[PDB]
Design an enzyme around this catalytic site. Structure first.
Site, PDB file in Angstrom:
ATOM      1  N   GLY A 153       8.947   3.973  -3.732  1.00  0.00           N
ATOM      2  CA  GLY A 153       9.235   5.392  -3.819  1.00  0.00           C
ATOM      3  C   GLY A 153      10.443   5.828  -3.024  1.00  0.00           C
ATOM      4  N   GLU A 154      10.879   7.063  -3.293  1.00  0.00           N
ATOM      5  CA  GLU A 154      12.002   7.712  -2.634  1.00  0.00           C
ATOM      6  C   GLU A 154      11.499   8.998  -1.990  1.00  0.00           C
ATOM      7  N   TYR A 187      14.111  12.190   2.830  1.00  0.00           N
ATOM      8  CA  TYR A 187      15.185  11.696   3.698  1.00  0.00           C
ATOM      9  C   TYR A 187      15.079  10.169   3.920  1.00  0.00           C
ATOM     10  N   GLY A 188      14.886   9.432   2.828  1.00  0.00           N
ATOM     11  CA  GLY A 188      14.789   7.978   2.866  1.00  0.00           C
ATOM     12  C   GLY A 188      14.115   7.331   1.674  1.00  0.00           C
ATOM     13  N   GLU A 189      13.667   6.076   1.863  1.00  0.00           N
ATOM     14  CA  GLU A 189      13.033   5.255   0.829  1.00  0.00           C
ATOM     15  C   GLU A 189      11.788   4.520   1.339  1.00  0.00           C
ATOM     16  N   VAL A 190      10.906   4.140   0.404  1.00  0.00           N
ATOM     17  CA  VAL A 190       9.688   3.388   0.693  1.00  0.00           C
ATOM     18  C   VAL A 190       9.812   2.025  -0.004  1.00  0.00           C
ATOM     19  CG1 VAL A 190       7.146   3.296   0.577  1.00  0.00           C
ATOM     20  CG2 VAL A 190       8.283   5.489   1.002  1.00  0.00           C
ATOM     21  N   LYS A 194       8.073   2.732   5.123  1.00  0.00           N
ATOM     22  CA  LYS A 194       8.752   4.006   4.923  1.00  0.00           C
ATOM     23  C   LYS A 194       9.902   4.085   5.930  1.00  0.00           C
ATOM     24  CE  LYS A 194       7.935   9.009   4.804  1.00  0.00           C
ATOM     25  NZ  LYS A 194       6.934  10.057   4.465  1.00  0.00           N
ATOM     26  N   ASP A 201      -0.142  19.090   0.636  1.00  0.00           N
ATOM     27  CA  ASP A 201       0.581  18.689  -0.570  1.00  0.00           C
ATOM     28  C   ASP A 201      -0.265  17.719  -1.417  1.00  0.00           C
ATOM     29  OD1 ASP A 201       2.716  19.046  -2.382  1.00  0.00           O
ATOM     30  OD2 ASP A 201       4.014  17.528  -1.422  1.00  0.00           O
TER      31      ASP A 201
HETATM   32  C1  LIG Z   1       4.351   8.135   3.001  1.00  0.00           C
HETATM   33  O1  LIG Z   1       5.218   8.883   2.161  1.00  0.00           O
HETATM   34  C2  LIG Z   1       5.563   8.360   0.905  1.00  0.00           C
HETATM   35  C3  LIG Z   1       4.867   7.241   0.376  1.00  0.00           C
HETATM   36  C4  LIG Z   1       5.246   6.680  -0.858  1.00  0.00           C
HETATM   37  C5  LIG Z   1       4.523   5.500  -1.371  1.00  0.00           C
HETATM   38  C6  LIG Z   1       4.030   4.512  -0.480  1.00  0.00           C
HETATM   39  C7  LIG Z   1       3.275   3.477  -0.946  1.00  0.00           C
HETATM   40  C8  LIG Z   1       2.970   3.327  -2.323  1.00  0.00           C
HETATM   41  C9  LIG Z   1       3.522   4.237  -3.225  1.00  0.00           C
HETATM   42  C10 LIG Z   1       4.265   5.338  -2.731  1.00  0.00           C
HETATM   43  N1  LIG Z   1       3.607   4.072  -4.606  1.00  0.00           N
HETATM   44  C11 LIG Z   1       3.322   2.979  -5.424  1.00  0.00           C
HETATM   45  C12 LIG Z   1       3.979   2.994  -6.704  1.00  0.00           C
HETATM   46  C13 LIG Z   1       3.895   1.919  -7.585  1.00  0.00           C
HETATM   47  C14 LIG Z   1       3.148   0.795  -7.238  1.00  0.00           C
HETATM   48  C15 LIG Z   1       2.506   0.751  -6.011  1.00  0.00           C
HETATM   49  C16 LIG Z   1       2.585   1.833  -5.072  1.00  0.00           C
HETATM   50  N2  LIG Z   1       1.973   1.594  -3.840  1.00  0.00           N
HETATM   51  C17 LIG Z   1       2.021   2.269  -2.619  1.00  0.00           C
HETATM   52  O2  LIG Z   1       1.171   1.873  -1.786  1.00  0.00           O
HETATM   53  C18 LIG Z   1       6.331   7.265  -1.578  1.00  0.00           C
HETATM   54  C19 LIG Z   1       7.004   8.375  -1.063  1.00  0.00           C
HETATM   55  C20 LIG Z   1       6.625   8.948   0.178  1.00  0.00           C
HETATM   56  C21 LIG Z   1       7.340  10.214   0.618  1.00  0.00           C
HETATM   57  O3  LIG Z   1       7.622  10.314   1.819  1.00  0.00           O
HETATM   58  O4  LIG Z   1       7.567  11.054  -0.277  1.00  0.00           O
END
Ligand SMILES: COc1cc(-c2ccc3c(c2)Nc2ccccc2NC3=O)ccc1C(=O)O
Length: 266
Positions: free
Chosen positions: A14-15, A18-21, A36, A120
């Protein structure tokens, strides 16, 4: 044991604002974690995450500060986002939505119990592990509404317009718990109808006016069965003081309705 502290970044999960995951794989154990990367809002996210320990909340393993870039180590959920289990204009089978709604209530009850409001709640922030267990994700907008047993009223406008409660758009101050309860009702609507009921809960919004006029013969409500729709009638109540609380959701007829279920023969 050498190299146990080394992780390889394999895929973009994910995005953030203010960054990427990124998905990180351990060099020795091949254990998967989510990292993150963020360049008062991240300081609060690490702090709120340090308090959390629940089966329906994404686990925080720790953080490392390397100058300007902050690295957050979080539990990896291989099933992805709940958003991708929702078929547009169809939703998902009712027993699956009920199981996901139970796990969402367990997570939200936990958070409210320790005085935290997520702010959220939406299917993008609901992640699924390998056994399809729901996990509440992203505490970047989260805040403390109860401290030393004293409740503080909120006034900050945040979240995502289709999921926000109407008091957030009409009142200067509001209680934190009914706001998360409302967003859970919009998640339940999306799961059962595969569509969002309105752009925002305002009187200028025709779809929202139709709901207050009880025009359930229209979409998305016509696609939802009477038992879960009766629960939505209690959640999506404009007055937050009259809105159903989670202890009363746990006594709802559809909430307690039995719906969801290797073997050899002879
Ligand atoms: C903790 O915050 C986030 C967390 C994520 C995120 C973290 C882990 C996962 C995930 C999203 N999505 C995901 C998508 C496809 C396949 C697997 C996953 N697994 C995740 O654990 C994405 C964006 C943010 C943000 O700050 O907007």
């Amino acid at each position: 044991v050498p190299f146990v502290e080394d992780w390889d970044l394999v895929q973009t999960l994910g995005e953030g604002a203010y960054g990427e995951v990124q998905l990180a794989v351990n060099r020795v154990t091949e254990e998967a974690v989510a990292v993150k990367i963020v360049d008062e809002n991240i300081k609060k996210e690490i702090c709120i995450n340090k308090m959390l320990n629940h089966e329906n909340v994404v686990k925080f393993y720790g953080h490392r500060r390397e100058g300007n870039i902050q690295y957050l180590f979080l539990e990896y959920c291989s099933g992805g986002e709940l958003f991708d289990r929702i078929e547009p204009d169809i939703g998902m089978p009712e027993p699956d939505a009920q199981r996901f709604f139970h796990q969402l209530m367990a997570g939200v009850v936990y958070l409210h119990g320790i005085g935290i409001t997520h702010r959220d709640i939406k299917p993008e922030n609901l992640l699924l592990d390998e056994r399809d267990n729901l996990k509440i994700s992203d505490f970047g907008l989260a805040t403390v509404f109860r401290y030393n047993n004293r409740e503080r009223l909120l006034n900050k406008m945040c979240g995502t317009l289709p999921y926000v409660a109407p008091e957030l758009l009409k009142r200067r101050e509001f209680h934190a718990e009914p706001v998360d309860v409302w967003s859970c009702g919009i998640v339940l609507t999306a799961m059962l109808a595969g569509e969002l009921p309105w752009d925002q809960p305002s009187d200028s919004c025709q779809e929202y006016s139709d709901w207050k006029e009880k025009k359930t013969y229209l979409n998305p409500w016509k696609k939802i069965d009477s038992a879960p729709l009766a629960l939505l009638h209690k959640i999506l109540v404009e007055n937050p003081s009259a809105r159903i609380t989670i202890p009363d959701i746990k006594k709802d007829r559809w909430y307690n309705k039995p719906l969801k279920k290797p073997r050899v023969t002879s």
